[PDB]
Design a protein around this ligand. Structure first.
Ligand SMILES: Cc1ncc(C[n+]2csc(CCOP(=O)(O)OP(=O)(O)O)c2C)c(N)n1
Ligand SMILES: Cc1ncc(C[n+]2csc(CCOP(=O)(O)OP(=O)(O)O)c2C)c(N)n1
Ligand SMILES: [Mn+2]
Ligand SMILES: [Mn+2]
Lengths: 556, 556
């Protein structure tokens, strides 16, 4: 009889179903139409609940939680533009694999397209970007509970990667005391309510078969390219490449320890590309390669075969090489395609890489962002993790620093948005409970400024470095036209971040030299709170330093 | 020959075409893939160029510009999540009619679904929310310029209302000197380049016919309901209703002068609803009605016919009455269906409305948000405009204040999002160049916090009042469950806004009484800058005051 009561019973099935698929974290934004979902969530002891007022930040908070935990994370939002704000995080998850389960409250069908407040067309509004889309019907006891749980179980069970849009219409009344409406309906599921498994278990695995001719191919002159992978996978790939005697080109996101560091510089040297021309096979593990020189070499190389191993689906080679696209867990794949010890075939490149790093070290002293990137390994928190932002910082660290093998690195490098980096970092921290270093640019920090609210709650110290070069200086690295560059590309905002930190009662430092930076870090790691460290640098020094180093190494 | 040059020639045709359809403002966010569009725009002297770093805010800036100017406004963003961030403003425009032209740069077809950085599936990504969607092909001289301009002319010419998504793929290279590549291709348009008209003129008008039985219905017992309309339309509707002798229920968005004010209160009285049962016809002009009591009365009433007149398309009656949905400019419609002088038929409601206002007046003294809303008419800038935020503020002004006829009011009440109110207010100000009073809540201000960057550039004084009641106190008005209310609904953030103002070098006041508030107002109207006035109030006083006044008036 009670619509409000049945709404909550319907919602309770949805939420309990998710607990059977490893959902522990749920991120909730405020609203009224979402009440049945939010109250079901609040009442369910399985969840860790996170809240935020900006649904775009909420989506990215969820992204960060999923990124680190490798488990599906749920999101609840009310109807309207609240739903639209989830798009950026959903798109990124589609590219890098995070399992985001978006529970989006909706008006019932009778209030769509009739000028009702906060009512929009929500089914399909994320187009092809969710992996799965469920448009739930108007709640009714005439649809059995077993149908509802089965539909959720199909979506979660068959989810290899990416987001799920579950649209959830509810009619008013939304409020009122619970009565027994829908209880017998729920009880048709019997002791499933006390179970720890799905109602319907549907969990096919997607995996490429082992390559039977690997033992032939591993005897050839190969190159290993390591992109984004897990910290442990990076260590395994490093050992595997060494054993093969193949050069390892390691991305900043790879955690391989980058045995041939500064590839963005030495790949610019003709002696290196000449040697790499001898490669008959390239085996790339992971994807979303960072550096321009690596992307250019990848595009130009012409091995007999190009393989990409990764656990995400679809084509991952933007140069469309003849070869293989192998879907697998990287660690598992390495066990199936083991290395046998063989004499290394590269002679010139190890020397060039050493020389390249020496050239960077020679310029370590200036208090600039290139130097900060080069030295960043000196500031990584012990037993911690690094979250690297987009634009120049990820490129500078990739080109100029040698990050330790197995030290966890996280990022948003699918679509490389600058719109959710602070909120993502917050989720990254909360998921693992580890001390966290996050580094972002000034426009990036402004973009997600209100996520400083989230950083008021971290479980271990988090240092947020904001590199302030007054605008998007990546457009001083790119050959943008000088006449239009400041107004239409760089867009300097001429701000500092001391007042932003103060607004959210976060500790703040603006160090003016290396000694003050070291003192700031020493202060920051002492407590389970977020410290903002603003590094103010001259606009174009970072870009010019990279360019000068590129040129120097190309002449070695 | 030159891809970079032809990209810019292709883009120049797109941008020049827009100028023939009244596009003067263009809002641009930074990026590289957007270069052909952005350089074409920068070079075109027809445009007023606005920039911002947050694409969600950029969209709302454009929304505000369009809202006031009543012309199409263009937006340029780069590929990736930048495009997704335009969704909230596009959705709101779909509902309230703003013509937003979204030029979204894209990767070319050969770089989609292959793991390329910042490349996503963009065609159709806004689903059914744009009025028109154009997915442009990969640029080539083998497609003639006359096709490109004709497609743009079709989209703009036939655009009654709402957004247009124009997806614009460009292949690299994007940079390089202009040469003559594509010049002869452009010149196929001949002296269209020196013309002031579209290439293809396609502009059918959509309008309902004269109602031939209006002379019959205008003699009946009617009620006029006035929703959102232009300031001039509000004055016309007031005079028209007055002439007919029909009671006018005027929304805060109507600018009718609200001759029967506090309708949200007196509609709660059974005597008013009893009198309204006599209405044989209801003529509603405008839509998006604000108040709960009005929405409830509208839903319950049973006149022989219910008419809704508005220049927006589609059903606008969420109660689905028997009647008519008439598409027209409201001022035009009134001229086509003029009033006849007739004796007013309502007797009780004028009594109740006066009594309701006296009840509110009796409680005007406390320094609270209800009192601020009641008194806001006393503080409107001369020759200015009011921008009213969402949640409690719009409801309190609607329920408790009597706004002057023809005094411009602007709002985002289609989807009623709290995600873009500051950036929308900026656009509203820039469009008219008028002194602006903007009022929003604390979560709303946090949501669009970085839009304070935009408010650093206003052409006349803008007073931004932030009502800080520590959370979304609309959920103290709604019957939300007390146990979950704070954590999962109200979400207090426990901040103030002095540091936010300081960050963007905006003047700031936190007045503690009316004298200090009036002093702040006086100072603020003196210069063409934004002043932030933070009104800190006890969390639940506003909601409770509204609840008490409702009860008091219901018992009259
Ligand atoms: C949501 C979004 N909008 C636009 C872009 C394009 N973009 C890439 S880098 C960049 C500049 C970032 O500026 P900042 O954070 O100051 O970093 P810097 O370039 O100075 O290193 C922009 C606007 C993007 N990647 N994501
Ligand atoms: C983008 C978006 N997310 C969520 C909502 C639901 N909602 C309506 S009002 C409101 C609270 C706004 O809080 P505040 O700005 O402090 O205003 P107050 O309720 O205190 O008047 C919320 C979350 C919305 N309208 N838009
Ligand atoms: Mn910067
Ligand atoms: Mn509030």
């Amino acid at each position: 009889m009670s619509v409000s009561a049945f709404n909550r019973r319907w919602a309770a099935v949805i939420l309990e179903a998710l607990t059977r698929h490893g959902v522990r974290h749920i991120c909730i934004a405020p609203g009224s139409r979402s009440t049945p979902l939010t109250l079901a969530a609040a009442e369910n002891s399985a969840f860790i609940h996170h809240t935020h007022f900006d649904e775009r930040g909420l989506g990215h908070l969820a992204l960060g939680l999923a990124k680190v935990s490798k488990q599906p994370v749920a999101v609840i939002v009310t109807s309207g533009t609240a739903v639209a704000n989830l798009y950026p995080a959903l798109i990124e998850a589609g590219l890098t694999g995070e399992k985001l389960i978006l529970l989006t409250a909706d008006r019932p069908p009778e209030l769509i397209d009739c000028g009702a407040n906060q009512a929009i067309r929500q089914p399909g509004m994320f187009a092809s970007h969710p992996t799965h889309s469920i448009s739930l019907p108007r709640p009714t006891q005439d649809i059995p509970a077993r149908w509802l749980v089965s539909t959720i179980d199909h979506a979660l069970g068959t989810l290899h990667a990416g987001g799920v849009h579950i649209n959830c219409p509810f009619a008013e009344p939304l409020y009122g005391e619970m009565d027994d409406t829908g209880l017998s309906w729920q009880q048709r599921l019997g002791d499933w309510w006390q179970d720890d498994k799905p109602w319907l278990r549907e969990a096919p695995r997607l995996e490429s078969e082992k390559q039977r001719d690997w033992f032939f191919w591993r005897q050839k002159r190969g190159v290993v390219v390591a992109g984004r992978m897990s910290a442990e996978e990076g260590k395994k790939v490093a050992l595997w490449a060494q054993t093969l005697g193949w050069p390892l080109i390691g991305d900043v996101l790879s955690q391989t320890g980058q045995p041939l560091p500064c590839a963005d510089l030495w790949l610019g040297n003709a002696k290196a590309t000449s040697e790499l021309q001898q490669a008959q096979i390239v085996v790339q593990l992971g994807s979303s390669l960072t550096g321009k020189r690596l992307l250019q070499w990848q595009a130009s190389c012409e091995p007999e075969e190009y393989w990409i191993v990764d656990d995400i689906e679809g084509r991952l080679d933007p140069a469309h090489h003849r070869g293989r696209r192998l879907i697998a867990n990287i660690a598992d794949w390495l066990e199936l395609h083991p290395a046998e010890k063989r004499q290394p075939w590269c002679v010139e490149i190890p020397r060039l890489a050493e020389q390249a790093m020496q050239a960077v070290i020679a310029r370590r002293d200036a208090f600039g962002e290139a130097q900060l990137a080069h030295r960043i390994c000196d500031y990584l928190p012990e037993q911690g993790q690094l979250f690297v932002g987009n634009s120049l910082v990820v490129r500078l660290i990739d080109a100029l620093s040698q990050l330790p093998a197995g030290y966890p690195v996280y990022s948003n490098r699918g679509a490389s948005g600058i719109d959710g980096l602070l909120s993502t970092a917050a989720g990254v921290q909360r998921a693992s409970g580890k001390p966290t270093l996050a580094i972002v640019g000034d426009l990036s920090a402004l973009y997600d400024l209100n996520a400083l609210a989230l950083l008021r709650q971290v479980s271990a110290p988090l240092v947020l470095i904001v590199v302030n070069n007054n605008g998007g200086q990546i457009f001083s690295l790119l050959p943008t036209p000088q006449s239009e560059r400041e107004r239409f590309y760089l867009m300097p905002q001429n701000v500092h971040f001391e007042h932003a930190a103060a607004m959210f009662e976060l500790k703040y430092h603006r160090p003016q030299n290396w000694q003050e930076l070291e003192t700031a870090f020493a202060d920051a790691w002492r407590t389970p709170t977020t410290t903002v460290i603003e590094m103010v640098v001259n606009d174009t020094d970072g870009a010019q330093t990279l360019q000068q180093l590129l040129a120097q190494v190309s002449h070695l």
